[PDB]
Amino acid sequence: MENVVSAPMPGKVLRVLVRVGDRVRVGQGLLVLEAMKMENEIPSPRDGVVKRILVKEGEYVDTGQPLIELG
């Protein structure tokens, strides 16, 4: 059951913290989203493997936009 991490709010991708193929833990930061005058680390919802990274540093995203797919 692959699943997708989508943006919970609009903002700018400031940093991507993982690479395709990385093992991740639940709660691990996948990227940093600039929003509400803060940096916001967007978490993995579960243990797994990063299958796809769908955004790049510098990119603006909106709510519901797919960011990361887990395998």
Author numbering: 79 to 149
Please share text taken word for word from the publication where this structure appeared.
In this work, we used the C-terminal 70-residue fragment of PhBCCP (PhBCCPΔN79) as the template to prevent the N-terminal heterogeneity that was observed in PhBCCPΔN76.
The A138I mutant and the A138Y mutant produced another orthorhombic crystal form belonging to space group C2221 and a trigonal crystal form belonging to space group P3121, respectively. Neither the C orthorhombic nor the trigonal crystals could be obtained with the wild-type protein. Therefore, it is conceivable that the substitution of Ala by Ile/Tyr with a better crystal-packing propensity created novel packing interfaces. On the other hand, the crystal packings of the A138I and A138Y mutants are rich in attractive electrostatic interactions and nonpolar interactions, respectively. The order of the normalized number of nonpolar interactions corresponds to that of the resolution.
